[PDB]
Design an enzyme around this catalytic site. Structure first.
Site, PDB file in Angstrom:
ATOM      1  N   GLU A  35     -25.106  18.578   3.116  1.00  0.00           N
ATOM      2  CA  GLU A  35     -25.655  19.341   4.240  1.00  0.00           C
ATOM      3  C   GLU A  35     -27.117  18.681   4.723  1.00  0.00           C
ATOM      4  O   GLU A  35     -27.255  18.557   6.050  1.00  0.00           O
ATOM      5  CB  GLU A  35     -26.243  20.615   3.646  1.00  0.00           C
ATOM      6  CG  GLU A  35     -26.768  21.717   4.378  1.00  0.00           C
ATOM      7  CD  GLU A  35     -25.824  22.147   5.768  1.00  0.00           C
ATOM      8  OE1 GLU A  35     -26.211  23.168   6.168  1.00  0.00           O
ATOM      9  OE2 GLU A  35     -24.754  21.961   5.688  1.00  0.00           O
ATOM     10  N   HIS A  46     -29.398  13.831  18.733  1.00  0.00           N
ATOM     11  CA  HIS A  46     -29.952  14.551  19.699  1.00  0.00           C
ATOM     12  C   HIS A  46     -31.443  14.069  20.096  1.00  0.00           C
ATOM     13  O   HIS A  46     -31.906  14.363  21.460  1.00  0.00           O
ATOM     14  CB  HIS A  46     -30.225  16.052  19.273  1.00  0.00           C
ATOM     15  CG  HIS A  46     -28.842  16.807  19.129  1.00  0.00           C
ATOM     16  ND1 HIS A  46     -28.875  18.263  19.564  1.00  0.00           N
ATOM     17  CD2 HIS A  46     -27.758  16.533  18.607  1.00  0.00           C
ATOM     18  CE1 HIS A  46     -27.419  18.674  19.498  1.00  0.00           C
ATOM     19  NE2 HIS A  46     -26.748  17.405  18.858  1.00  0.00           N
ATOM     20  N   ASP A  47     -32.109  13.634  19.249  1.00  0.00           N
ATOM     21  CA  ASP A  47     -33.381  12.802  19.504  1.00  0.00           C
ATOM     22  C   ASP A  47     -32.951  11.735  20.625  1.00  0.00           C
ATOM     23  O   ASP A  47     -33.647  11.770  21.714  1.00  0.00           O
ATOM     24  CB  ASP A  47     -34.139  12.187  18.504  1.00  0.00           C
ATOM     25  CG  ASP A  47     -35.558  11.738  18.807  1.00  0.00           C
ATOM     26  OD1 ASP A  47     -36.020  10.924  18.175  1.00  0.00           O
ATOM     27  OD2 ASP A  47     -36.173  12.325  19.774  1.00  0.00           O
ATOM     28  N   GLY A  62     -35.674   9.255  25.259  1.00  0.00           N
ATOM     29  CA  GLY A  62     -34.803   8.734  24.379  1.00  0.00           C
ATOM     30  C   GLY A  62     -35.282   9.139  22.743  1.00  0.00           C
ATOM     31  O   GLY A  62     -35.723   9.989  22.611  1.00  0.00           O
ATOM     32  N   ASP A  64     -37.354   8.861  20.721  1.00  0.00           N
ATOM     33  CA  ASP A  64     -38.704   8.794  20.711  1.00  0.00           C
ATOM     34  C   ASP A  64     -39.398   9.632  19.762  1.00  0.00           C
ATOM     35  O   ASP A  64     -40.760   9.675  20.134  1.00  0.00           O
ATOM     36  CB  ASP A  64     -39.180   9.014  22.161  1.00  0.00           C
ATOM     37  CG  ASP A  64     -38.702  10.338  22.929  1.00  0.00           C
ATOM     38  OD1 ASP A  64     -38.123  11.240  21.980  1.00  0.00           O
ATOM     39  OD2 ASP A  64     -39.390  10.633  23.722  1.00  0.00           O
ATOM     40  N   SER A  66     -39.510  12.978  20.001  1.00  0.00           N
ATOM     41  CA  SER A  66     -39.834  14.038  20.924  1.00  0.00           C
ATOM     42  C   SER A  66     -39.405  15.423  19.847  1.00  0.00           C
ATOM     43  O   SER A  66     -40.209  16.308  20.117  1.00  0.00           O
ATOM     44  CB  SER A  66     -39.341  13.911  21.960  1.00  0.00           C
ATOM     45  OG  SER A  66     -37.807  14.021  22.118  1.00  0.00           O
ATOM     46  N   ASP A 179     -22.493  25.376  11.867  1.00  0.00           N
ATOM     47  CA  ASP A 179     -23.080  26.733  11.506  1.00  0.00           C
ATOM     48  C   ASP A 179     -23.101  27.790  12.644  1.00  0.00           C
ATOM     49  O   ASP A 179     -23.244  28.769  12.591  1.00  0.00           O
ATOM     50  CB  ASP A 179     -24.354  26.657  10.759  1.00  0.00           C
ATOM     51  CG  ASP A 179     -24.539  25.770   9.674  1.00  0.00           C
ATOM     52  OD1 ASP A 179     -23.219  25.661   8.938  1.00  0.00           O
ATOM     53  OD2 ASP A 179     -25.527  25.209   9.251  1.00  0.00           O
ATOM     54  N   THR A 193     -12.614  16.189   5.073  1.00  0.00           N
ATOM     55  CA  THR A 193     -13.338  15.301   4.094  1.00  0.00           C
ATOM     56  C   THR A 193     -14.795  15.163   4.673  1.00  0.00           C
ATOM     57  O   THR A 193     -15.152  13.934   4.886  1.00  0.00           O
ATOM     58  CB  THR A 193     -12.708  14.007   4.013  1.00  0.00           C
ATOM     59  OG1 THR A 193     -12.450  13.273   5.294  1.00  0.00           O
ATOM     60  CG2 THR A 193     -11.339  14.216   3.285  1.00  0.00           C
ATOM     61  N   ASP A 198     -14.456   8.427   6.763  1.00  0.00           N
ATOM     62  CA  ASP A 198     -12.901   8.286   6.996  1.00  0.00           C
ATOM     63  C   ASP A 198     -12.697   8.575   8.281  1.00  0.00           C
ATOM     64  O   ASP A 198     -13.252   9.091   9.245  1.00  0.00           O
ATOM     65  CB  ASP A 198     -12.336   8.467   5.846  1.00  0.00           C
ATOM     66  CG  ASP A 198     -12.297  10.349   5.660  1.00  0.00           C
ATOM     67  OD1 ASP A 198     -12.918  10.809   6.775  1.00  0.00           O
ATOM     68  OD2 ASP A 198     -11.660  10.749   4.626  1.00  0.00           O
TER      69      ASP A 198
HETATM   70  C1  HEM Z   1     -19.583  15.068  23.046  1.00  0.00           C
HETATM   71  C2  HEM Z   1     -20.424  14.945  22.333  1.00  0.00           C
HETATM   72  C3  HEM Z   1     -20.640  15.744  21.016  1.00  0.00           C
HETATM   73  C4  HEM Z   1     -20.586  17.044  20.961  1.00  0.00           C
HETATM   74  C5  HEM Z   1     -20.188  18.257  22.263  1.00  0.00           C
HETATM   75  C6  HEM Z   1     -20.876  17.562  19.852  1.00  0.00           C
HETATM   76  C7  HEM Z   1     -21.002  18.930  19.340  1.00  0.00           C
HETATM   77  C8  HEM Z   1     -21.210  19.308  17.915  1.00  0.00           C
HETATM   78  C9  HEM Z   1     -21.369  20.769  17.472  1.00  0.00           C
HETATM   79  C10 HEM Z   1     -21.002  21.895  18.414  1.00  0.00           C
HETATM   80  C11 HEM Z   1     -21.525  20.602  16.182  1.00  0.00           C
HETATM   81  C12 HEM Z   1     -21.908  22.055  15.297  1.00  0.00           C
HETATM   82  C13 HEM Z   1     -23.335  22.294  15.262  1.00  0.00           C
HETATM   83  C14 HEM Z   1     -23.637  23.696  14.529  1.00  0.00           C
HETATM   84  O1  HEM Z   1     -22.852  24.735  15.277  1.00  0.00           O
HETATM   85  O2  HEM Z   1     -24.029  23.820  13.587  1.00  0.00           O
HETATM   86  C15 HEM Z   1     -21.851  19.254  15.734  1.00  0.00           C
HETATM   87  C16 HEM Z   1     -22.354  18.987  14.377  1.00  0.00           C
HETATM   88  C17 HEM Z   1     -22.680  17.437  14.064  1.00  0.00           C
HETATM   89  N1  HEM Z   1     -22.580  16.538  15.328  1.00  0.00           N
HETATM   90 FE1  HEM Z   1     -21.749  16.385  16.879  1.00  0.00          FE
HETATM   91  N2  HEM Z   1     -21.204  16.495  19.108  1.00  0.00           N
HETATM   92  C18 HEM Z   1     -21.128  15.284  19.928  1.00  0.00           C
HETATM   93  C19 HEM Z   1     -21.654  14.270  19.478  1.00  0.00           C
HETATM   94  C20 HEM Z   1     -22.301  13.685  18.182  1.00  0.00           C
HETATM   95  C21 HEM Z   1     -22.604  12.322  18.034  1.00  0.00           C
HETATM   96  C22 HEM Z   1     -22.918  11.270  18.942  1.00  0.00           C
HETATM   97  C23 HEM Z   1     -23.252  12.473  16.781  1.00  0.00           C
HETATM   98  C24 HEM Z   1     -23.902  11.230  16.206  1.00  0.00           C
HETATM   99  C25 HEM Z   1     -23.591  10.123  16.292  1.00  0.00           C
HETATM  100  C26 HEM Z   1     -23.054  13.607  16.113  1.00  0.00           C
HETATM  101  C27 HEM Z   1     -23.024  14.118  14.941  1.00  0.00           C
HETATM  102  C28 HEM Z   1     -23.050  15.336  14.202  1.00  0.00           C
HETATM  103  C29 HEM Z   1     -23.117  15.664  13.049  1.00  0.00           C
HETATM  104  C30 HEM Z   1     -23.369  14.762  11.798  1.00  0.00           C
HETATM  105  C31 HEM Z   1     -22.864  17.089  12.860  1.00  0.00           C
HETATM  106  C32 HEM Z   1     -23.004  18.015  11.792  1.00  0.00           C
HETATM  107  C33 HEM Z   1     -24.282  18.660  11.641  1.00  0.00           C
HETATM  108  C34 HEM Z   1     -23.967  19.285  10.193  1.00  0.00           C
HETATM  109  O3  HEM Z   1     -23.253  19.526   9.408  1.00  0.00           O
HETATM  110  O4  HEM Z   1     -25.215  20.127   9.904  1.00  0.00           O
HETATM  111  N3  HEM Z   1     -22.325  14.509  17.179  1.00  0.00           N
HETATM  112  N4  HEM Z   1     -21.642  18.324  16.866  1.00  0.00           N
HETATM  113 CA   LIG Z   2     -14.389  12.686   6.763  1.00  0.00          CA
HETATM  114 CA   LIG Z   3     -35.908  12.213  22.160  1.00  0.00          CA
END
Ligand code: HEM
Ligand SMILES: [Ca+2]
Ligand SMILES: [Ca+2]
Ligand SMILES: *[C@@H]1O[C@H](CO)[C@@H](O[C@@H]2O[C@H](CO)[C@@H](O)[C@H](O)[C@H]2NC(C)=O)[C@H](O)[C@H]1NC(C)=O
Ligand SMILES: *[C@H]1O[C@H](CO)[C@@H](O)[C@H](O)[C@@H]1O
Length: 357
Positions: A35, A46-47, A62, A64, A66, A179, A193, A198
């Site tokens: 988690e 997001h940063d 970017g 940074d 922030s 969440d 997974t 993977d």
């Molecule tokens: C089109 C782009 C993307 C969209 C729309 C998107 C959207 C989302 C959403 C809606 C969640 C769930 C948040 C929640 O409700 O708790 C999430 C989780 C996550 N995203 Fe993305 N994401 C995108 C790109 C990325 C990228 C570029 C990365 C990193 C390189 C990233 C890494 C993660 C991780 C690791 C989680 C899991 C967080 C957790 O389990 O606490 N995401 N994403």
């Molecule tokens: Ca996986």
């Molecule tokens: Ca930033």
């Protein structure tokens, strides 16, 4: 340079990252892709992505820090819902490890977190980002309800990312849960997974959806192929954006091209992250501290497989020019639960600090 602990490193300025990695591992990750690691990986993105070529520097700086330096601004934007916990978890490290900028902390922490996920690359880590910035403006973070045109344009405007680089970065959804998308359930994973870096997410998004892990009416969500949950073991969630990317003509072949291609996926992710991590900076102005990123856990080397209750007949294919691989199916008539914990146990609460975000 030889660091106080005796470790020999590329550059003296990299030494302080050694105790930071150890502190992050001991305190918040416990060498797991769990988690708290997931939350930090999301924060790295997001940063970094809150920057705009078209809008200019006043829209955001970017990668940074922030999020940490202005904890009451961006974390409260709707597109940043849930980012608070990661921010509050890193602020104490910023205060303690006070030779390392907030920006560098964020990127490094993500690299350390990723290293705990079997199969992940060992990210490049450059250091030396300043410790002063501005709060970003709203609207820079992609959202799951967004169209592929909007997503691709956002990434082009942030940093010139290609569609290949965008889909590459979405390998992170191999180790990701939700969440906030559905109010009624917690920790809904995007693949079967979520502790393993993977290619399962790429496969599983291509399967026909058959239900929802929670309710059916959430913004940004579409039907899941593996919706069954029980107890803490929440069913798989599918984001509209991932679905849309998997089927759009611009990205479908790229998406499919990662199925059962672990090394390709990991290498492609590394290359895109190298670009993401330095948004807002000239890379020629940052020192290379890659040698202090922990060595990542290796994959087992096994091919991707259809989860029980799925198979090839369930594929929704969208790439006319590339053959979908031959994969095995895990035996069983019904869906397996996706474990809530990296060890399959009944309890694995993440460490969480209170804070301003
Ligand atoms: C089109 C782009 C993307 C969209 C729309 C998107 C959207 C989302 C959403 C809606 C969640 C769930 C948040 C929640 O409700 O708790 C999430 C989780 C996550 N995203 Fe993305 N994401 C995108 C790109 C990325 C990228 C570029 C990365 C990193 C390189 C990233 C890494 C993660 C991780 C690791 C989680 C899991 C967080 C957790 O389990 O606490 N995401 N994403
Ligand atoms: Ca996986
Ligand atoms: Ca930033
Ligand atoms: C980067 O900026 C932050 C925020 O101003 C600094 O955080 C302060 O750190 C000192 C210890 O050095 C603490 O006494 C303060 O409480 C912290 N401030 C806040 C708002 O949390 C941090 O030291 C700076 N880091 C570097 C490398 O300059
Ligand atoms: C996971 O669990 C399902 C049952 O819920 C099985 O069908 C599968 O074989 C695996 O044991």
């Amino acid at each position: 340079a030889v660091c106080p602990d005796g470790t020999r490193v590329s550059h003296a300025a990299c030494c302080a990252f050694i105790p930071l990695a150890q502190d992050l591992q001991e305190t918040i990750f416990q060498n797991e892709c769990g988690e708290d690691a997931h939350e930090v990986i999301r924060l790295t993105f997001h940063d970094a992505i809150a920057i705009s070529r078209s809008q200019g520097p006043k829209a955001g700086g970017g990668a940074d820090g922030s999020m940490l330096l202005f904890p009451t601004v961006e974390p409260n934007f709707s597109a940043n819902n849930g980012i608070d916990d990661s921010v509050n978890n890193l602020i104490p490290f910023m205060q303690k490890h006070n030779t390392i900028s907030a920006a560098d902390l964020v990127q490094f922490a993500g690299a350390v977190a990723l290293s705990n996920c079997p199969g992940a690359p060992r990210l490049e880590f450059l250091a030396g980002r300043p410790n002063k910035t501005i709060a970003a403006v709203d609207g820079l973070i992609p959202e799951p309800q967004d169209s592929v045109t909007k997503i691709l344009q956002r990434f082009e405007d942030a940093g010139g990312f290609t569609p290949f680089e965008v889909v590459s970065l979405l390998a992170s959804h191999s180790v990701a849960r939700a969440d906030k998308v559905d109010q009624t359930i917690d920790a809904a994973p995007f693949d079967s997974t979520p502790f393993t870096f993977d290619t399962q997410v790429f496969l599983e998004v291509l399967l026909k959806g058959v239900g929802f892990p929670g309710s059916a009416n959430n913004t940004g969500e579409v039907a899941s192929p593996l919706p069954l949950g029980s107890g803490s073991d929440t069913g798989e969630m599918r984001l509209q954006s991932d679905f849309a990317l998997a089927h759009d003509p611009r990205t479908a072949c790229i998406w499919q091209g990662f199925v059962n291609e672990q090394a390709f996926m990991a290498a492609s992710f590394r290359a895109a992250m190298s670009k993401l991590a330095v948004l807002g900076h000239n890379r020629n102005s940052l020192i290379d501290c890659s040698d202090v990123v922990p060595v990542p856990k290796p994959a087992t080397g096994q091919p991707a497989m259809f989860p029980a209750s799925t198979g090839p007949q369930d594929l929704e294919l969208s790439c006319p020019s590339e053959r979908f691989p031959t994969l095995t199916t895990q035996p069983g008539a019904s869906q397996s639960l996706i474990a809530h914990c990296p060890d399959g146990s009944m309890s694995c609460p993440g460490v969480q600090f209170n804070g301003p975000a």
